[PDB]
Design a protein around this motif. Structure first.
Motif, PDB file in Angstrom:
ATOM      1  N   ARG A   1      17.139  20.460   8.285  1.00  6.45           N
ATOM      2  CA  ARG A   1      16.325  21.055   9.342  1.00  6.45           C
ATOM      3  C   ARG A   1      15.678  20.002  10.241  1.00  6.45           C
ATOM      4  O   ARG A   1      15.506  20.235  11.447  1.00  6.45           O
ATOM      5  N   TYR A   2      15.343  18.828   9.698  1.00  6.73           N
ATOM      6  CA  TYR A   2      14.537  17.852  10.430  1.00  6.73           C
ATOM      7  C   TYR A   2      15.325  16.660  10.951  1.00  6.73           C
ATOM      8  O   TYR A   2      14.727  15.764  11.555  1.00  6.73           O
TER       9      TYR A   2
ATOM     10  N   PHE B   1      12.059  33.671   7.019  1.00  4.51           N
ATOM     11  CA  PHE B   1      10.922  33.091   7.732  1.00  4.51           C
ATOM     12  C   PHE B   1      11.361  31.876   8.545  1.00  4.51           C
ATOM     13  O   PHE B   1      10.929  31.695   9.693  1.00  4.51           O
ATOM     14  N   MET B   2      12.257  31.060   7.983  1.00  3.41           N
ATOM     15  CA  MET B   2      12.840  29.947   8.737  1.00  3.41           C
ATOM     16  C   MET B   2      13.600  30.449   9.957  1.00  3.41           C
ATOM     17  O   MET B   2      13.451  29.914  11.060  1.00  3.41           O
TER      18      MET B   2
ATOM     19  N   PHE C   1      11.572  18.251  -0.002  1.00  4.34           N
ATOM     20  CA  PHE C   1      12.288  19.104   0.941  1.00  4.34           C
ATOM     21  C   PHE C   1      12.421  18.443   2.308  1.00  4.34           C
ATOM     22  O   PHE C   1      13.472  18.543   2.952  1.00  4.34           O
ATOM     23  N   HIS C   2      11.368  17.767   2.776  1.00  2.00           N
ATOM     24  CA  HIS C   2      11.414  17.219   4.128  1.00  2.00           C
ATOM     25  C   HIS C   2      12.371  16.050   4.258  1.00  2.00           C
ATOM     26  O   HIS C   2      12.783  15.729   5.374  1.00  2.00           O
TER      27      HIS C   2
ATOM     28  N   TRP D   1       3.893  22.721  -5.409  1.00  2.00           N
ATOM     29  CA  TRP D   1       4.163  22.806  -3.979  1.00  2.00           C
ATOM     30  C   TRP D   1       4.131  21.424  -3.337  1.00  2.00           C
ATOM     31  O   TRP D   1       4.905  21.154  -2.411  1.00  2.00           O
TER      32      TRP D   1
ATOM     33  N   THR E   1      -0.103  29.976  10.961  1.00  2.00           N
ATOM     34  CA  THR E   1       1.304  29.782  11.307  1.00  2.00           C
ATOM     35  C   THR E   1       2.097  29.226  10.131  1.00  2.00           C
ATOM     36  O   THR E   1       3.298  29.501  10.010  1.00  2.00           O
ATOM     37  N   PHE E   2       1.450  28.449   9.263  1.00  2.13           N
ATOM     38  CA  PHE E   2       2.080  27.999   8.029  1.00  2.13           C
ATOM     39  C   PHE E   2       2.084  29.074   6.954  1.00  2.13           C
ATOM     40  O   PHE E   2       2.819  28.942   5.969  1.00  2.13           O
TER      41      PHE E   2
ATOM     42  N   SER F   1      11.724  33.669   2.461  1.00  2.00           N
ATOM     43  CA  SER F   1      11.455  32.340   3.015  1.00  2.00           C
ATOM     44  C   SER F   1      12.558  31.898   3.962  1.00  2.00           C
ATOM     45  O   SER F   1      12.285  31.288   5.005  1.00  2.00           O
TER      46      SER F   1
ATOM     47  N   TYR G   1       1.663  33.572  15.414  1.00  2.00           N
ATOM     48  CA  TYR G   1       2.892  33.275  16.138  1.00  2.00           C
ATOM     49  C   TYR G   1       2.803  33.742  17.589  1.00  2.00           C
ATOM     50  O   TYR G   1       3.284  33.055  18.501  1.00  2.00           O
TER      51      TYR G   1
ATOM     52  N   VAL H   1       7.538  20.379  -1.382  1.00  2.00           N
ATOM     53  CA  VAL H   1       7.474  20.180   0.064  1.00  2.00           C
ATOM     54  C   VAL H   1       7.786  18.733   0.420  1.00  2.00           C
ATOM     55  O   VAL H   1       8.465  18.453   1.414  1.00  2.00           O
TER      56      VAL H   1
ATOM     57  N   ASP I   1      11.126  31.589  12.613  1.00  2.00           N
ATOM     58  CA  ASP I   1      10.611  30.440  13.348  1.00  2.00           C
ATOM     59  C   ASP I   1      11.614  29.975  14.398  1.00  2.00           C
ATOM     60  O   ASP I   1      11.237  29.653  15.531  1.00  2.00           O
TER      61      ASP I   1
ATOM     62  N   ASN J   1       4.426  18.725   6.670  1.00  2.92           N
ATOM     63  CA  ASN J   1       5.416  19.204   7.628  1.00  2.92           C
ATOM     64  C   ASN J   1       5.154  18.647   9.020  1.00  2.92           C
ATOM     65  O   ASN J   1       6.085  18.216   9.697  1.00  2.92           O
TER      66      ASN J   1
ATOM     67  N   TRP K   1       1.882  32.304   0.915  1.00  3.93           N
ATOM     68  CA  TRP K   1       2.371  31.536  -0.229  1.00  3.93           C
ATOM     69  C   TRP K   1       1.400  31.638  -1.396  1.00  3.93           C
ATOM     70  O   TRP K   1       1.815  31.720  -2.554  1.00  3.93           O
TER      71      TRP K   1
ATOM     72  N   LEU L   1      13.535  24.524  -1.838  1.00  2.02           N
ATOM     73  CA  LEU L   1      12.103  24.471  -1.576  1.00  2.02           C
ATOM     74  C   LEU L   1      11.352  25.471  -2.447  1.00  2.02           C
ATOM     75  O   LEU L   1      10.362  25.129  -3.094  1.00  2.02           O
TER      76      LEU L   1
HETATM   77  C1  LIG Z   1       9.025  27.546   9.676  1.00  2.00           C
HETATM   78  C2  LIG Z   1       8.789  26.944   8.288  1.00  2.00           C
HETATM   79  N1  LIG Z   1       7.648  27.505   7.563  1.00  2.00           N
HETATM   80  C3  LIG Z   1       8.113  28.246   6.390  1.00  2.00           C
HETATM   81  C4  LIG Z   1       9.221  29.242   6.728  1.00  2.00           C
HETATM   82  C5  LIG Z   1       6.856  28.400   8.407  1.00  2.00           C
HETATM   83  C6  LIG Z   1       5.725  29.044   7.601  1.00  2.00           C
HETATM   84  C7  LIG Z   1       6.759  26.413   7.139  1.00  2.00           C
HETATM   85  C8  LIG Z   1       7.315  25.399   6.112  1.00  2.00           C
HETATM   86  C9  LIG Z   1       8.000  24.269   6.549  1.00  2.00           C
HETATM   87  C10 LIG Z   1       8.489  23.349   5.634  1.00  2.00           C
HETATM   88  C11 LIG Z   1       8.274  23.538   4.282  1.00  2.00           C
HETATM   89  C12 LIG Z   1       7.585  24.655   3.834  1.00  2.00           C
HETATM   90  C13 LIG Z   1       7.102  25.579   4.748  1.00  2.00           C
END
Ligand SMILES: CC[N+](CC)(CC)Cc1ccccc1
Ligand SMILES: [Mg+2]
Ligand SMILES: [Mg+2]
Ligand SMILES: [Mg+2]
Length: 340
Positions: free
Chosen positions: A323-324, A80-81, A317-318, A310, A182-183, A77, A157, A314, A84, A225, A188, A57
């Protein structure tokens, strides 16, 4: 190929994917970091880390970044996952005290990451290591802006924690405002600057074309997302999702909400295409014949190019990330890569 309900032909035709040459080393280095910082169990690192595609990503986004800059971004990053995931698990298990203490430690570690590199809480120590490295690339003025932005993310959060504990789904407009936090839209956007080697002056990054291009890149990513993570989030009792706000407050069906989120995502693309022309005209204007002007012009052009990257990173990535993939899980409410 992407399912038709999630397919965006404009991305596939007009936003070709890019990949940073450091990616192969990035994939393994971040995996080793997650293991060594104890951010994920060893068996889950070996089973799931590469399949989660977190380094992919970022390597599809911050093109041109120095290898060490991309490494710090990728580690942050991936952290950060995991954060979450921890936030979600604290909500699910009602660990209000543990969340509150973590929230406070992250605020403190954000301002003084060096002090927290060996903290007993491995999630805090991992955050601090990535943040301290991010703080070594540009002047302290950039670090202070990153911190200001992330203090706001932490509190968003916390608002999500309160919403889910209280059984509250935000209104659509309330959600869209919260989602910019939250994103981590502005994080970024901040990270574009060490990736191109230049802290942009306020007058440059606050130019309306730069601001609008930066905003639309993140709105697309967050709402895409929402579109793709909706199944996992419904299954996990997550309430924060544009589709969930539309179902709850506008009484749309699940199919109607998916179509509405999709249309809003599509509009981000063509709004971005329009403002991208203005942002690249601004980049040209900064090239006033001076050395500093050439530097600022090149930096803005690189950053706007990564705002465009981006979209494609993105998007793919999905569809690539484990993850999904809620349909593959024994318990749809508990992803297997999460510490339950
Ligand atoms: C929990 C995921 N995220 C980034 C760590 C939170 C800000 C958003 C995100 C999800 C999917 C792709 C890019 C960012
Ligand atoms: Mg989530
Ligand atoms: Mg979240
Ligand atoms: Mg989501």
């Amino acid at each position: 190929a992407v399912p038709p309900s999630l397919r965006l032909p404009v991305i596939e035709a007009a936003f070709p994917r890019q990949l940073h040459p450091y990616w192969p080393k990035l994939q393994e280095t971040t995996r080793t970091w997650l293991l060594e910082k104890r951010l994920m169990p060893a068996d889950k690192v070996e089973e799931y880390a590469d399949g989660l595609c977190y380094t992919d990503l970022m390597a599809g986004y911050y093109l041109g970044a120095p290898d060490e800059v991309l490494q710090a971004i990728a580690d942050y990053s991936a952290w950060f996952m995991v954060w979450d995931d921890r936030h979600d698990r604290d909500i699910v298990h009602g660990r209000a005290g543990a969340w509150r203490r973590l929230r406070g430690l992250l605020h403190t570690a954000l301002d003084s990451p060096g002090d927290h590199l060996h903290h007993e809480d491995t999630l805090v120590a991992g955050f601090a290591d990535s943040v301290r490295r991010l703080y070594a690339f540009l002047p302290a003025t950039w670090n202070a802006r990153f911190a200001r932005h992330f203090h706001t993310v932490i509190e968003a959060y916390d608002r999500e924690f309160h919403n889910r504990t209280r059984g509250i789904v935000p209104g659509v407009e309330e959600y869209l405002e919260l989602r910019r936090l939250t994103f981590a839209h502005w994080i970024w956007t901040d990270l574009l600057e060490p990736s191109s080697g230049c802290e942009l002056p306020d007058a440059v990054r606050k130019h309306p074309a730069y601001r609008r291009a930066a905003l639309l890149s993140q709105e697309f990513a967050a709402w895409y997302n929402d579109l793709c993570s909706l199944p996992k989030e419904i299954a996990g009792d997550e309430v924060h999702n544009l589709g969930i706000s539309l179902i709850t407050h506008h009484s749309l069906t699940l199919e109607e909400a998916i179509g509405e989120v999709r249309r809003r995502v599509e509009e981000c693309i063509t709004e971005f295409l329009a403002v991208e022309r203005d942002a690249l005209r601004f980049a040209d204007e900064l090239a006033d014949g001076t050395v500093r002007g050439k530097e600022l012009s090149g930096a803005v052009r690189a950053n706007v190019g990564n705002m465009r990257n981006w979209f494609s990173s993105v998007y793919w990535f999905h569809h690539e990330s484990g993850r999904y993939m809620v349909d593959s899980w024994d318990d749809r409410s508990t992803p297997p890569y999460v510490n339950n």
